[PDB]
């Protein structure tokens, strides 16, 4: 009941913005779950920085004493969240 | 140097927002470039829905004639953008 030309530039931008909205709501929810567990913000930041493969932030947080064994709301750690083997080993190799 | 208690709730919130902004800004710009590259909107929508693993959207778009062999700016298709084997096979098995 629909053809290729029934989709235009506005349909692409609208889907982008809608999914962008759901992404902000979902990632905000994840943040509050972390803060609502009594995890120190510095360990929470490492969990995020690990997810993002953010090497400079990872190095900064470890130097300040971030603990990479702390478990999140899924029972998973910054090592689990590390988005690559190299990120995993940067964290382990500090 | 820095310490563990130098990081607070506001740091957690600011880091999520900073990373969320970078994500949005990168994907928004890539999306707009694809549009200006006169790739058909329905094919761009399949690329985005594949990235999202949005099964109802993918099925709607494929019924409408969306083409999963079209390549984006990185040479990649909706098949490549799929986040899992289940979504890959959903697209291929239509």
Contacts of B87 (CB under 8 A, 6+ apart): B50, B53, B55, B58
Q: How far is CA B19 from CA A42, A52, A61, B58, in A?
A: 16, 8, 16, 27
Residue among B70, B29, B45 nearest A6 (CA): B45
From the CA of A44, how many Å to the nearest CA of chain B?
Answer: 7
A-B Cβ pairs (cutoff 8 Å, strict): 96
Residue A1, SS3?
coil
Closest to B20 (Cα-Cα) out of A55, A35, A22, A72: A22
Structure tokens at B66: 């969306």
Alpha-carbon distances of B79 from A47, A53, B10, rounded to whole Å? 30, 24, 39
Q: Which residues of chain A are within 8 Å of residue B4 when distances are taken between CB atoms?
A: 40, 42, 64-66
CB B33 within 8 A of CB B25: no
Q: Give the integer Cα–Cα distance in Å for A58 and A16.
A: 30
CA distance B85 to B22: 27
Mapping DSSP to helix (H, G, I), strand (E, B) and coil, where does residue A38 land? coil
**Cα→Cα distances B59→A10, A37, B32, B56, Å:** 20, 38, 23, 5
A64, with CB counted inside 10 A (0-12, 13-18, 19+), is middle
Architecture of the CATH domain B7-92: Alpha Horseshoe (1.25)
Distance, CA of A48 to CA of A77 (rounded, Å): 10
Say which experimental method was used. Answer: X-ray
Q: Is the dihedral of CA A44, A56, B13, A25 positive or negative?
A: negative
Structural tokens at position B62 = 């494929």
- Please give the helix or strand (H or E) that residue A42 lies within, else none: helix A41-51
Are A93 and A77 contacting, i.e. CB atoms less than 8 angstroms apart? no
Residues near A4 by beta carbon (within 8 Å), at least 6 away in sequence = B40, B42, B64, B65, B66
Which is it for the CA torsion B20, B21, B22, B23, positive or negative? positive
Q: Which two tokens stand for residue B55?
A: 């099964």
Separate counts of helices (H) and strands (E) for chain A: 5, 0
Q: Which residues on chain B are in Cβ contact (under 8 Å) with A63? A: 1-2
Contacts for A92 with CB less than 8 Å, ≥ 6 apart: A68, A79
Q: Which of A2, A60, A63 sits opposite B63 (nearest CB)?
A: A2
> Which H helix or E strand runs over A14?
helix A9-36
Q: Which of residues 15-74 of A touch B (CB under 8 A)?
A: 15-16, 19-20, 23-24, 27-28, 31, 34-35, 40-42, 44-45, 48-49, 52, 54, 57, 60-61, 63-66
Domain residue extents for chain A: 8-92
Please report the sign of the dihedral spanned by the C-alpha atoms of residue A24, residue A50, residue B54, residue A31.
negative
How far apart are alpha carbons A92 and B44 in whole angstroms? 40
Pick from A45, A46, A43, A42: which is nearest to A91 by CA? A46
H-type alpha helices, chain B: 9-36, 41-52, 55-63, 78-81, 85-92
DSSP B5: G
Tokens of A51: 């997810």
Name the class of domain A8-92: mainly alpha
């Amino acid at each position: 009941s629909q053809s290729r030309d029934d989709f235009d530039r506005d349909d692409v931008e609208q889907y982008f913005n809608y999914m962008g909205m759901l992404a902000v709501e979902g990632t905000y929810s994840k943040m509050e779950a972390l803060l609502n567990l009594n995890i120190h913000p510095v360990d929470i930041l490492l969990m995020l920085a690990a997810t993002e493969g953010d090497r400079p932030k990872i190095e900064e947080l470890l130097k300040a004493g971030a603990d990479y064994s702390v478990k999140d709301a899924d029972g998973r750690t910054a090592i689990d969240r590390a988005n690559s083997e190299e990120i995993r080993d940067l964290i382990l190799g500090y």
